[PDB]
Amino acid sequence: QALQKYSTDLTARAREGKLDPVIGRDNEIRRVVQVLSRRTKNNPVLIGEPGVGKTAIVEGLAQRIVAGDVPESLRDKTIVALDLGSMVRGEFEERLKAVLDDIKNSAGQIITFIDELHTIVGNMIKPMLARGELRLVGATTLDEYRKHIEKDAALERRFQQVYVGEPSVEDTIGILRGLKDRYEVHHGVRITDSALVAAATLSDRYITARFLPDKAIDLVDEAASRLRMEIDKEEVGPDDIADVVSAWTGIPAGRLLEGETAKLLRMEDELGKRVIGQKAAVTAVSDAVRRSRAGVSDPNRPTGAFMFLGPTGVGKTELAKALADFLFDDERAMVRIDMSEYGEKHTVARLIGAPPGYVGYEAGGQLTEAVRRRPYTVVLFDEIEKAHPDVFDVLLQVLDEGRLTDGHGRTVDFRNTILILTSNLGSGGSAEQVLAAVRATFKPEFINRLDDVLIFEGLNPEELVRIVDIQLAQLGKRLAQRRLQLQVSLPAKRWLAQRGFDPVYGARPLRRLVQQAIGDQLAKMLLAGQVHDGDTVPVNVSPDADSL
Amino acid sequence: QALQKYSTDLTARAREGKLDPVIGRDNEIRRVVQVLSRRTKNNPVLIGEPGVGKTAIVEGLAQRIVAGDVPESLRDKTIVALDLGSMVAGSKYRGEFEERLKAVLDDIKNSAGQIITFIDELHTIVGAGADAGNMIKPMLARGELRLVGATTLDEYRKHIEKDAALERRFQQVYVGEPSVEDTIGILRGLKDRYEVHHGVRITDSALVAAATLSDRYITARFLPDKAIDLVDEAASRLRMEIDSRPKEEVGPDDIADVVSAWTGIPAGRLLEGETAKLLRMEDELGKRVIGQKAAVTAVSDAVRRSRAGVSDPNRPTGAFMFLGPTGVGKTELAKALADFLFDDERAMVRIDMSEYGEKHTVARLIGAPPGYVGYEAGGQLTEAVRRRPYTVVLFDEIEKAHPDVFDVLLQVLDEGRLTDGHGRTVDFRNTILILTSNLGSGGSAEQVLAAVRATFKPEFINRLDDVLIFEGLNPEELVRIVDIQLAQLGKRLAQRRLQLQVSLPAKRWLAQRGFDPVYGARPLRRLVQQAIGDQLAKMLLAGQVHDGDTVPVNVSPDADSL
Amino acid sequence: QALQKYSTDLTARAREGKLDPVIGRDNEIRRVVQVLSRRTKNNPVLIGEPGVGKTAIVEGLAQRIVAGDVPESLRDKTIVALDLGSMFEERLKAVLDDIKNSAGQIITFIDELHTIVNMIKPMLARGELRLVGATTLDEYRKHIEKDAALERRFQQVYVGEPSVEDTIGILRGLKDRYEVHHGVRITDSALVAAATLSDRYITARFLPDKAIDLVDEAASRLRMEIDSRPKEEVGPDDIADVVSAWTGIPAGRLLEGETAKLLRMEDELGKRVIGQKAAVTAVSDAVRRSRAGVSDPNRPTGAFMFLGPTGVGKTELAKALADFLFDDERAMVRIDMSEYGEKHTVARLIGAPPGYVGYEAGGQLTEAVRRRPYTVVLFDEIEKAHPDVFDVLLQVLDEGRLTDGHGRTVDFRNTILILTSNLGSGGSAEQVLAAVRATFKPEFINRLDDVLIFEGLNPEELVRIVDIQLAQLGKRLAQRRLQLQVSLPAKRWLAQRGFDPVYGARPLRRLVQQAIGDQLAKMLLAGQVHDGDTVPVNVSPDADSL
Ligand SMILES: Nc1ncnc2c1ncn2[C@@H]1O[C@H](COP(=O)(O)OP(=O)(O)OP(O)(O)=S)[C@@H](O)[C@H]1O
Ligand SMILES: Nc1ncnc2c1ncn2[C@@H]1O[C@H](COP(=O)(O)OP(=O)(O)OP(O)(O)=S)[C@@H](O)[C@H]1O
Ligand SMILES: Nc1ncnc2c1ncn2[C@@H]1O[C@H](COP(=O)(O)OP(=O)(O)OP(O)(O)=S)[C@@H](O)[C@H]1O
Numbered sequence A: 001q002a003l004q005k006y007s008t009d010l011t012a013r014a015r016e017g018k019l020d021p022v023i024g025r026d027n028e029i030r031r032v033v034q035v036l037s038r039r040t041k042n043n044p045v046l047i048g049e050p051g052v053g054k055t056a057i058v059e060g061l062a063q064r065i066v067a068g069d070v071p072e073s074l075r076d077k078t079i080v081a082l083d084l085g086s087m088v089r090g091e092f093e094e095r096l097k098a099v100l101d102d103i104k105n106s107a108g109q110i111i112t113f114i115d116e117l118h119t120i121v122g123n124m125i126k127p128m129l130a131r132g133e134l135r136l137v138g139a140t141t142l143d144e145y146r147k148h149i150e151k152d153a154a155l156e157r158r159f160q161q162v163y164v165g166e167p168s169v170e171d172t173i174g175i176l177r178g179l180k181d182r183y184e185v186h187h188g189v190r191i192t193d194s195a196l197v198a199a200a201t202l203s204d205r206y207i208t209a210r211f212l213p214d215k216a217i218d219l220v221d222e223a224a225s226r227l228r229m230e231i232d233k234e235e236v237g238p239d240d241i242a243d244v245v246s247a248w249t250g251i252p253a254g255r256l257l258e259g260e261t262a263k264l265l266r267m268e269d270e271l272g273k274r275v276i277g278q279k280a281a282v283t284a285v286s287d288a289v290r291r292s293r294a295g296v297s298d299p300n301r302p303t304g305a306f307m308f309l310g311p312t313g314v315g316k317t318e319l320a321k322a323l324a325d326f327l328f329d330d331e332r333a334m335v336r337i338d339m340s341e342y343g344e345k346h347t348v349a350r351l352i353g354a355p356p357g358y359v360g361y362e363a364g365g366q367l368t369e370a371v372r373r374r375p376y377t378v379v380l381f382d383e384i385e386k387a388h389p390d391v392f393d394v395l396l397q398v399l400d401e402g403r404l405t406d407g408h409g410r411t412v413d414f415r416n417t418i419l420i421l422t423s424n425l426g427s428g429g430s431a432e433q434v435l436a437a438v439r440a441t442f443k444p445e446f447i448n449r450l451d452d453v454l455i456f457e458g459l460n461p462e463e464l465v466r467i468v469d470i471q472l473a474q475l476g477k478r479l480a481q482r483r484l485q486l487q488v489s490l491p492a493k494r495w496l497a498q499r500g501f502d503p504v505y506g507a508r509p510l511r512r513l514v515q516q517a518i519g520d521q522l523a524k525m526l527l528a529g530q531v532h533d534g535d536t537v538p539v540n541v542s543p544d545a546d547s548l
Numbered sequence B: 001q002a003l004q005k006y007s008t009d010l011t012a013r014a015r016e017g018k019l020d021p022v023i024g025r026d027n028e029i030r031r032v033v034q035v036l037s038r039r040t041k042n043n044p045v046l047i048g049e050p051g052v053g054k055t056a057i058v059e060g061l062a063q064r065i066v067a068g069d070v071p072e073s074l075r076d077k078t079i080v081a082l083d084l085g086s087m088v089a090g091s092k093y094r095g096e097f098e099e100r101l102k103a104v105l106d107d108i109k110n111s112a113g114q115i116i117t118f119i120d121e122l123h124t125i126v127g128a129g130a131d132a133g134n135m136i137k138p139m140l141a142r143g144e145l146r147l148v149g150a151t152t153l154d155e156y157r158k159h160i161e162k163d164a165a166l167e168r169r170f171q172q173v174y175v176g177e178p179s180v181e182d183t184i185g186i187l188r189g190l191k192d193r194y195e196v197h198h199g200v201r202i203t204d205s206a207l208v209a210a211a212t213l214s215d216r217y218i219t220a221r222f223l224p225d226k227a228i229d230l231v232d233e234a235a236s237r238l239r240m241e242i243d244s245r246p247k248e249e250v251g252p253d254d255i256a257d258v259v260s261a262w263t264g265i266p267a268g269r270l271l272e273g274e275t276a277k278l279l280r281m282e283d284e285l286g287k288r289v290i291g292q293k294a295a296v297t298a299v300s301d302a303v304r305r306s307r308a309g310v311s312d313p314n315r316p317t318g319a320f321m322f323l324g325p326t327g328v329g330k331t332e333l334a335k336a337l338a339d340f341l342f343d344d345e346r347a348m349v350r351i352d353m354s355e356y357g358e359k360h361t362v363a364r365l366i367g368a369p370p371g372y373v374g375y376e377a378g379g380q381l382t383e384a385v386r387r388r389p390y391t392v393v394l395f396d397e398i399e400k401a402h403p404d405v406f407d408v409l410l411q412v413l414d415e416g417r418l419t420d421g422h423g424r425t426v427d428f429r430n431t432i433l434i435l436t437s438n439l440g441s442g443g444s445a446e447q448v449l450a451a452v453r454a455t456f457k458p459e460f461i462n463r464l465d466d467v468l469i470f471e472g473l474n475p476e477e478l479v480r481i482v483d484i485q486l487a488q489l490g491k492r493l494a495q496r497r498l499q500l501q502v503s504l505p506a507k508r509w510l511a512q513r514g515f516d517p518v519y520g521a522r523p524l525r526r527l528v529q530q531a532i533g534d535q536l537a538k539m540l541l542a543g544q545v546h547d548g549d550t551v552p553v554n555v556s557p558d559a560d561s562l
Numbered sequence C: 001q002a003l004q005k006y007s008t009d010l011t012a013r014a015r016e017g018k019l020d021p022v023i024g025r026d027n028e029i030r031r032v033v034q035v036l037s038r039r040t041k042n043n044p045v046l047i048g049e050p051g052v053g054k055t056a057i058v059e060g061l062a063q064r065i066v067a068g069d070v071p072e073s074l075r076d077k078t079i080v081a082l083d084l085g086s087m088f089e090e091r092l093k094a095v096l097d098d099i100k101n102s103a104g105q106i107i108t109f110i111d112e113l114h115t116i117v118n119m120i121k122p123m124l125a126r127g128e129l130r131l132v133g134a135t136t137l138d139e140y141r142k143h144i145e146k147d148a149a150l151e152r153r154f155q156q157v158y159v160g161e162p163s164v165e166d167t168i169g170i171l172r173g174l175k176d177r178y179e180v181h182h183g184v185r186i187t188d189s190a191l192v193a194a195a196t197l198s199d200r201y202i203t204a205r206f207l208p209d210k211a212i213d214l215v216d217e218a219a220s221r222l223r224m225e226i227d228s229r230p231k232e233e234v235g236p237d238d239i240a241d242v243v244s245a246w247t248g249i250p251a252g253r254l255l256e257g258e259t260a261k262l263l264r265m266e267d268e269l270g271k272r273v274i275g276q277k278a279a280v281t282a283v284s285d286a287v288r289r290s291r292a293g294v295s296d297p298n299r300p301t302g303a304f305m306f307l308g309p310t311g312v313g314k315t316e317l318a319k320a321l322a323d324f325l326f327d328d329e330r331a332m333v334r335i336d337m338s339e340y341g342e343k344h345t346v347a348r349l350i351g352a353p354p355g356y357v358g359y360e361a362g363g364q365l366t367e368a369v370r371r372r373p374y375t376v377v378l379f380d381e382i383e384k385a386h387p388d389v390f391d392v393l394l395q396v397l398d399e400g401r402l403t404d405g406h407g408r409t410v411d412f413r414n415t416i417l418i419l420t421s422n423l424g425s426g427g428s429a430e431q432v433l434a435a436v437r438a439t440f441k442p443e444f445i446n447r448l449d450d451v452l453i454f455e456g457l458n459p460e461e462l463v464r465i466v467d468i469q470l471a472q473l474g475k476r477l478a479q480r481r482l483q484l485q486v487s488l489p490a491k492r493w494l495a496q497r498g499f500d501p502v503y504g505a506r507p508l509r510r511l512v513q514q515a516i517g518d519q520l521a522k523m524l525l526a527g528q529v530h531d532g533d534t535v536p537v538n539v540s541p542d543a544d545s546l
């Protein structure tokens, strides 16, 4: 008791009850008390993620001790904690000597407890430990333990691992409903099982950074404190927590609800807000994605394997960029891999990378290393017609079983991704020879496993005004730093169509063609004068070109 | 008062009887003595792979000194357990560890030559520098202190042999691991300590079974403690089972229970229920593999022999290669087997030999030599098998990889050996290698048994076991195949509450269309999908179908309909 | 009660009404009290940068406490502070005894507790003192980030710096304290000028304090110029003046002589770079769209890469760019990406982390851009570097900052980024297009400006190059006063002879040297061409005599 100033007790304060009961996880306690009852390789170590209940388990064991249920060997033996962030160059070993000598002259079996000892281990506790007078019960995380206790240890022969992965939704619900009254007297508002389960499921699904047993308690206590402060509604409810989750992540409370009906019914113009025209294609793709997640298709298949070809610049990619945006909440998800370099027989191994020990190994394959991470992407395939007739075997293997093999040896999974095989075939035919050319060029049976093979319909000579109109609505945001508004006039706006189409690349220059013109033609006025932040900047169609 | 707070007295500890009774190893104690009794440079160092008892010899020497069984110039020497973890620990100044080390050395050399010293794990002697662990050499190479040490092979080579002028002052005593008989002796010697600690009893048959199993199934650690740990584990488990629960001694099958409770190997003596399952195998496997009566008996007999106790302990549990016409159920038989003895279809290690048409692609299942790109990662197959040493290896369609990959299996088989990049070795002694093919393609048994000979080599066909040939799909049993497929579909339709009322003519037309003689039952799952699943999907999201309805099917004159 | 001297009070000052002006951040105060009235992860800390007003945050918290908008457990809570000017370990026990023995009613506020973290850890383990603090992000991340013992009792609360509309009233509340020393008038124009000028350009300090120091130095400058040799009030002029004298980046209304040069950049730069009309147009449109305030606020004010055939001007253009903005060539940061042939050379431009041999040396890029953050960086031969520095540049683009070994963050939102290479060198347009798309990933080229292409030299373009080289040689051998006399036939002869359209202009320098300097240096050491002389040259049948 001489230097008990860097150490807290667990049984003394247990004699008062300032701890929390840890109902659940009764296997781990039995495993630990069994390990601690051996003769060699005793003093186990708790291995698990941060925020899972390791301290909870050791406290539950402490409470079972103070009650008295364990074998009388372990009975009548106290526990003492330690905090290492208080010890830490030097004199850390001096205080280590002090505490170890204290334990040693205590002359008993007073168990210790050392949290995150991966900062402690070194050679100073092994001569103490391989003698049988002290019992240390530590804790750390999996990969960290694999670091400090495997390379420089040579001590792992005297440490026994114990695994505590994570509780489930149903278990953390029981945990919450056990730990409810304490807060109903801390603040005291009211609690609803609907609120508890909503917190559990929503945290599990959307707060993908922290973990369950502490993550749920954090949100619940935060909502309770907010609703106690709000009195500056005497209950907490599902909305009373969804508001907090929305404030936390950024996604509003609306979309944080039922994710099947109210989502698969949003396959409407919500796409057409980014894509223009091609409503037939949007409808076909929406039906394909709706029926795919019904729950009757085979569980090993891409979530969609359709392709679309024809004229460029119509927004072929734009459909996919909007599609990934709506589904996976990001448009920086699709990955475009051109099928141009893959015109050689040998280069098919570029998108995998076969051997360990050859040129391209560490970089991985172009396709897999960009899929095994972020398994939610939307892969694109430009000019699928120019790829050698050997990658199509790879594609077959993809859309015949939702998995593939890289070179490292890993297995990449494709059962919740979307394939899109763009092209440029069909330059002359409307709907009669384009399908015949697609049948003849590709293997006519490989196409069978594909979904709808729709062709994008051309842009109406009128329906360029809508695309350029979204373009103008966008570029209106550009000069929001000086609030200089812009003009609109059908002659000027339609003047962009016949002079910016150039029907070989569709509408790719239609952004630069107008942005450089208007921006850099007004950029001198923006420094000289002639405008302030209420002026329509009336631009007109001069006899030849677009001056102001 | 110098070596009083940096050292204990191992001799006095042994006098207090609190040490373990070493049994055997008289050769090494005699060698250590006849080295420690030299004139100059008398410092033995016990060397050997970790776990084999490199300290136990020093405790034995201490016990022998205390008892008085040593030569004339070795009596009453009081060997000392020195330590450096508590000398270099608290010192933050210039030249402070030196005063402590010099005080210890001075206290040694003042007394007569009767303070024989013992530093354990002396690979911690070269550091402490910043000229440390190096001022000791002038006293080492003159016979002033004795310094019995103990270090592992790896640490020795890595830490000392880089300091040659210091290694000269040492002598090596290669402490090799003991054999099974010596292990049984040691275990029988130590039995009483655990029998007293845990209030249970331990049987000699249990000790023998422990010393025999711990050598055949845990091939990563070493014997004299690898065995003892099992006895301790089983004693503790029996203690816990006795207590806390309102024929009280360990048995020779509780050890098998432990050594199967980890490493996954089902090693045992056929406890009840297991024998019922094994006897009930050919039929229990038939519910997933209709057809192929000849093959199932062979694999079943292999498993039976392997688990009954009559099989060569150093060779795989079977190396079958079955081949036949396309779409007959080869891969499916393998998967059904793995599902039988694991109930986990994704717990086997299949590798697709269709990818290895190139020569150099073999490196994925071996690794890379030292000094190349992927070296510390290992080999795919070797890594997958080093853990889970009970899987069912598969070689999908081994006819593509050109005849060089046949020169690794050539010794994987018949020994269960393989060596990856780091130079390790793995054991395939309790796996079931299975490698399909498609040689033949229509030809009779004597037109495909020529393809095998002209494709492989005698050194290869001689390795593997019976070359099972698969028959063709009988035109009748396809009704049961369609039955299986509809059962799997109904199993997929369980999140909802749907059932099916499949009619006999519909089932007949199904088994009739999509079994073309060249491809077997392969175009059946896709047909079932495109004729039931999509038709239902177009019919469920648009009303007119709801969960609970026992959906019937019809045999309309056109393609099948509801 | 025995803490009144070692620690000041915020309960007496609350009633006595004297308080620094507080405005806004009421939602932050509400968040503070909401997290204070919790059971776990209570008593937060403040994260930010120097010049937020976090002491002001807790002061407004105290004023609202004494006014009364609190929950039931906050009967004025008598919040206090712990003076770090109270600095052995024996006094601290009794100093903390009053806080411990309290009912959690004299909770303290440890301003800048970053380094305090032995004694207070167990004293906090029981949940009796709040010790709400105020620190910064760097100190949070280097001090209290990895320790899992204390991250269970601290829930950070981020703060927003730029609040121009309220900084107006802040100045209104602080203008008085500077009109007494400086007998000057800082008009409302000066208030809203300090508010809306130094934010985007002087992003080295922060708005609430850099704006205070701006008006402070402006009032000092005005009281200075009041005397004999230099206006009677601060307006929109002295503010911009002080904007210029900070970090070198110029930013005002207009320097009344810079608007002409900027309109004339293309023409002025054509006398040092020759040809490349598209290139000069694009490189000119890039800086004018920035100096006027049109460009986007979170981006380097210039970043693009060009390539093509050799000997065309890919480096000369960037060198002229460094010339026309700083008036000297040495004011360019140039690092050649050729030596970065291995992976582990990333720390050469980043600095090795604490604990290794070269630790105080610092990087080669981040250290040169941290101080004086306006120069132009030249990444010569970017194609040669290991394809991992490309990932650092990935962060650099569209984000505008990077971290080095010590853990500090530097800014890149006002510099120019030049990268060059010669990918392909034989492909006309499509080969090189696919090559640049394939060597760098499309997610890195996405962010860039136009990737330019240089076209190559032609006959009409080489006579001007010859004239430039001859003027340069004159400038060189002017210090022996041997000014040249060259004939137009010889000029055209050189421009014709050195023309080959595969190497560009370097053969022209080679020919100039080997043709003139040979004979000139032969004569100059044998006499007869002594100083103060004018040598003629004339086209001989093959050579050109002197
Ligand atoms: N089964 C449980 N019963 C009671 N409380 C639990 C349970 N599981 C988790 N908790 C609580 O969840 C919180 C997590 O505490 P910790 O045990 O420290 O977390 P951890 O997962 O063990 O990792 P650390 O220690 O936070 S790094 C504590 O408030 C526990 O009381
Ligand atoms: N001949 C023996 N007689 C009695 N017990 C033995 C004998 N050999 C080994 N043991 C026991 O087996 C275990 C071996 O432990 P140690 O020899 O102390 O470990 P070690 O040999 O020092 O190996 P390292 O390098 O320290 S991991 C102990 O439990 C010993 O009691
Ligand atoms: N006797 C059988 N019992 C059950 N399913 C069978 C049987 N014979 C064939 N099948 C089915 O036939 C299909 C093809 O079986 P697989 O074994 O996967 O093909 P395969 O044997 O690998 O032939 P190849 O040469 O590899 S294409 C699967 O859907 C099996 O379920």
Ligand SMILES: Nc1ncnc2c1ncn2[C@@H]1O[C@H](COP(=O)(O)OP(=O)(O)OP(O)(O)=S)[C@@H](O)[C@H]1O
Pocket (backbone or CB within 6 Å): C272, C273, C274, C275, C309, C310, C311, C312, C313, C314, C315, C316, C317, C422, C465, C504, C505, C506, C509
């Ligand atoms: N348009 C130009 N204007 C002025 N000097 C030029 C021009 N083009 C080439 N030169 C000269 O020719 C030489 C080429 O200079 P650099 O720009 O360094 O070469 P480069 O064009 O960058 O090609 P590389 O890839 O760097 S070798 C220098 O001596 C320049 O002065």
Ligand SMILES: Nc1ncnc2c1ncn2[C@@H]1O[C@H](COP(=O)(O)OP(=O)(O)O)[C@@H](O)[C@H]1O
Pocket (backbone or CB within 6 Å): A274, A275, A276, A277, A312, A313, A314, A315, A316, A317, A318, A467, A470, A505, A506, A507, A508, A510, A511
């Ligand atoms: N339906 C559309 N909706 C919105 N923008 C479009 C649409 N079609 C074309 N665009 C514009 O035209 C450009 C060309 O799109 P895209 O088809 O991806 O080019 P490419 O033909 O090179 O694939 C896009 O940058 C986009 O801004």
Ligand SMILES: Nc1ncnc2c1ncn2[C@@H]1O[C@H](COP(=O)(O)OP(=O)(O)O)[C@@H](O)[C@H]1O
Pocket (backbone or CB within 6 Å): C020, C021, C022, C023, C049, C050, C051, C052, C053, C054, C055, C056, C170, C171, C173, C174, C209
């Ligand atoms: N919102 C505000 N309005 C007026 N004056 C303020 C405001 N915030 C702070 N101040 C005053 O200006 C100074 C800002 O310095 P300080 O608060 O120490 O910066 P930091 O928050 O970085 O520590 C304070 O001394 C305070 O008296």
